[PDB]
Symmetry: C2
Subunit: 61 residues, 2 copies
């Protein structure tokens, strides 16, 4: 899948993740904002929601 | 000054910073979002803008 990718400070770029999923990592507590996007599907926890998707392209918007 | 305060994952709380300023730390590159708020006035750089203020209360919104 094609996915957006950035850390909390890096420029957002497009990345071909191939056969991995895309993820979108957001904070759960207000103010709710996306902290990171990339390839794979890392674990969320009490403060962080991690959405993982494989379709469409750029699904981790 | 009274200031908002949170890290990238912590719950936002109100904090009496006393005689320090408030800061608001934002990313410069899209998507532009606030990564952190607190007491003091840490340095920004190429990826991070840091606004520092002393008035009004909660100025680092």
């Amino acid at each position: 899948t094609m996915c957006y990718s950035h850390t909390t400070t890096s420029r957002a770029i497009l990345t071909n993740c191939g056969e991995n999923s895309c993820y979108r990592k957001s904070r759960r507590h207000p103010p709710k904002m996306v902290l990171g996007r990339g390839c794979g599907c890392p674990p969320g926890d009490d403060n962080l929601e991690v959405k993982c998707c494989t379709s469409p392209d750029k699904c981790n918007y």
